[PDB]
Design an enzyme around this catalytic site. Structure first.
Site, short mmCIF file in Angstrom:
data_model
loop_
_atom_site.label_atom_id
_atom_site.label_comp_id
_atom_site.label_asym_id
_atom_site.label_seq_id
_atom_site.Cartn_x
_atom_site.Cartn_y
_atom_site.Cartn_z
N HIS A 1 0.81 -1.23 0.00
CA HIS A 1 0.00 0.00 0.00
C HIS A 1 0.85 1.30 0.00
CE1 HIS A 1 0.15 1.21 4.26
NE2 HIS A 1 0.04 -0.08 4.58
N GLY B 1 2.09 5.85 10.25
CA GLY B 1 3.51 5.79 9.93
C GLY B 1 4.21 4.55 10.47
N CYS C 1 3.34 1.47 9.54
CA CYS C 1 3.20 0.36 8.59
C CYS C 1 4.57 -0.13 8.18
CB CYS C 1 2.34 0.75 7.40
SG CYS C 1 0.72 1.40 7.84
C1 LIG Z 1 -2.91 3.97 6.29
C2 LIG Z 1 -4.08 3.16 6.91
C3 LIG Z 1 -3.81 2.65 8.37
O1 LIG Z 1 -4.69 2.03 8.95
N1 LIG Z 1 -2.63 3.00 8.95
C4 LIG Z 1 -2.27 2.80 10.29
C5 LIG Z 1 -1.62 1.66 10.77
N2 LIG Z 1 -1.43 1.37 12.07
C6 LIG Z 1 -1.90 2.23 12.97
C7 LIG Z 1 -2.56 3.44 12.64
C8 LIG Z 1 -3.04 4.35 13.62
C9 LIG Z 1 -3.64 5.51 13.24
C10 LIG Z 1 -3.81 5.83 11.90
C11 LIG Z 1 -3.37 4.97 10.93
C12 LIG Z 1 -2.74 3.74 11.26
C13 LIG Z 1 -5.33 4.06 6.93
O2 LIG Z 1 -5.45 5.10 7.56
N3 LIG Z 1 -6.29 3.47 6.17
C14 LIG Z 1 -5.84 2.28 5.61
C15 LIG Z 1 -6.53 1.38 4.79
C16 LIG Z 1 -5.88 0.24 4.36
C17 LIG Z 1 -4.56 0.02 4.73
CL1 LIG Z 1 -3.78 -1.47 4.29
C18 LIG Z 1 -3.86 0.93 5.52
C19 LIG Z 1 -4.52 2.05 5.98
#
Ligand SMILES: C[C@@]1(C(=O)Nc2cncc3ccccc23)C(=O)Nc2ccc(Cl)cc21
Ligand SMILES: [Cl-]
Lengths: 297, 302
Positions: free
Chosen positions: B41, B143, B145
């Site tokens: 992603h 951030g 990921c």
């Molecule tokens: C980037 C994102 C995600 O969940 N990241 C995060 C990952 N981990 C913790 C987070 C805490 C707060 C905010 C964002 C966090 C998002 O915001 N939407 C979304 C949809 C699909 C994917 Cl595979 C990834 C994401």
């Protein structure tokens, strides 16, 4: 989201762990520059016992490589073994003495080999509730502040209650403990009030607001309640330290104190805060800001 | 003595963390040999997140679009491939700090350490369990990921998780290092929910054996149970069914303490019925389920 008992990355400390053997006793050493720091009980009147030892009696091992000891001195309850090789993996470091309530990461080692890393707090009774087996002596406690490793603890012994006692890296014990087999007991423990309040702010930040109330208390009235529940006195310094968390959540420190007063008299009532049925006291106000903001090393 | 939620020393993993930038998105990568593994992603532009066609998005990217950073040193990307939900960036430099490693896919109930990173910089290490609902209850911000989950048994690092997303309940979803998600999750912004979670029964029993090993026997009782009767009660408390595999796995702990698995199951049923009554087990007022039978043997004996 999420709140976990999080330790500092142990990498900078792993590069320092060595195995110190003196006769039958085998424990861990902290190799920083050309000195290996380990508990002085590895020789077991320590001045008399050490004067009988020679440099070649101390077998120091860094991985499969044996370090040759070229000098030995004692600084309080720590043995400083001067070695011929300076550790190339020596990080930027400081020896700091921590105060009760302050937390640190422990890299538990056995035979100079790091086996685990965990977070813990210096209890008000100067013991730590660690996880140590025989051979864990010399395992160190540390914090990372930017790129510098601050060594604050070196494990020495286990008390009869299962709690641990050790020294700062200058060999000064935390608490009224001595490094010999004798009757020593951990004094009555208390809860680190500033840390519980910090953990309640972390819970608020994580969307847990059930324990909040419209009430606020005075510092005097909170300390009168806190003393009754074996909680450490909350000082104006603690209130000031909680300032940023109070600003971020919108709940004044004495408002969260009225919440803690209610949790102490009334209990949790089948509810949890951050997956816990108990009031967690091993996250300082800084640990909460570091984890709920994401500071890196 | 003592029982702590203990993570593996993170050093071998820290030397692998890099920052992967692709356009506006910045996340972490795992640099092993001359390959940097990161969530696929990283190529998405948020408005290409509800229904991303990653094959279409990746075919448009060139090697120089992926800025990889290891400390202050920028790694040059010389190839890129996709393996399920992970992006494998072939780089020109092989990581000298690459440890002995394996990619392992774990089963729910299994635990692992997580080295949480932001901008390819490790900020913290914590112990996690793969929940029965295939989510992890991590501590992650935006951030994070690409942050990985691992076990360091002996000198080999077994990579089992790479963080990808946070679900609406605050729990986290990710993949194994081959890019295969744990659970019925997709790397899309579509409505996805964590299924009803359950307690890892084998892990609670293992933690009760750790408590016996640490001198805590208050919860023990004169009762035994059939495995069927235990599961019938366990299901009512949202506990995972204990299988004969779980009973076999608990064999060494039963042997060491002298308490048959099914007698420990009777203690558990009683704790579920009565609660703790103001008491704690290993400093906990709740039944801990993130210590496997293997974690208990490792921490209590070696
Ligand atoms: C980037 C994102 C995600 O969940 N990241 C995060 C990952 N981990 C913790 C987070 C805490 C707060 C905010 C964002 C966090 C998002 O915001 N939407 C979304 C949809 C699909 C994917 Cl595979 C990834 C994401
Ligand atoms: Cl598994």
């Amino acid at each position: 989201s999420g709140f976990r008992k999080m330790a500092f990355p142990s990498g900078k400390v792993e590069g320092c762990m060595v195995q110190v053997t003196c006769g039958t006793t085998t424990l861990n050493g902290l190799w920083l520059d050309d000195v290996v720091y380990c508990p002085r009980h590895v020789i077991c009147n320590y001045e008399d016992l050490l004067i009988r030892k020679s440099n070649h009696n101390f077998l120091v091992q860094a991985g499969n490589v044996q370090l040759r000891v070229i000098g030995h001195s004692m600084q309080n309850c720590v043995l400083k073994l001067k070695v011929d090789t300076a550790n190339p993996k020596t990080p930027k470091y400081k020896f700091v003495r921590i105060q009760p309530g302050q937390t640190f990461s422990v890299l538990a080692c056995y035979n100079g080999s790091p086996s685990g890393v965990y977070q813990c707090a210096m209890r008000p009774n100067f013991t730590i509730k660690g996880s140590f087996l025989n051979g864990s002596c010399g395992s160190v406690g540390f914090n990372i502040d930017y790129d510098c490793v601050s060594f604050c603890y070196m494990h020495h012994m286990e008390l009869p209650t299962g709690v641990h006692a050790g020294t700062d890296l200058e060999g000064n014990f935390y608490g009224p403990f001595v490094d010999r087999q004798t009757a020593q007991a951990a004094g009555t423990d208390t809860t680190i009030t500033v840390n519980v309040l910090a953990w309640l702010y972390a819970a608020v930040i994580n969307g847990d607001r059930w324990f909040l109330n419209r009430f606020t208390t005075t510092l005097n009235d909170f300390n009168l309640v806190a003393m009754k529940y074996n909680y450490e006195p909350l000082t104006q310094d603690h209130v000031d330290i909680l300032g940023p968390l109070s600003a971020q959540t919108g709940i004044a420190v004495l408002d969260m104190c009225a919440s803690l007063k209610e949790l102490l008299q009334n209990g949790m009532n089948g509810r949890t805060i951050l997956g816990s049925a108990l009031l967690e006291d091993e996250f300082t106000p800084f640990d909460v800001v570091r984890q709920c903001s994401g500071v890196t090393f």
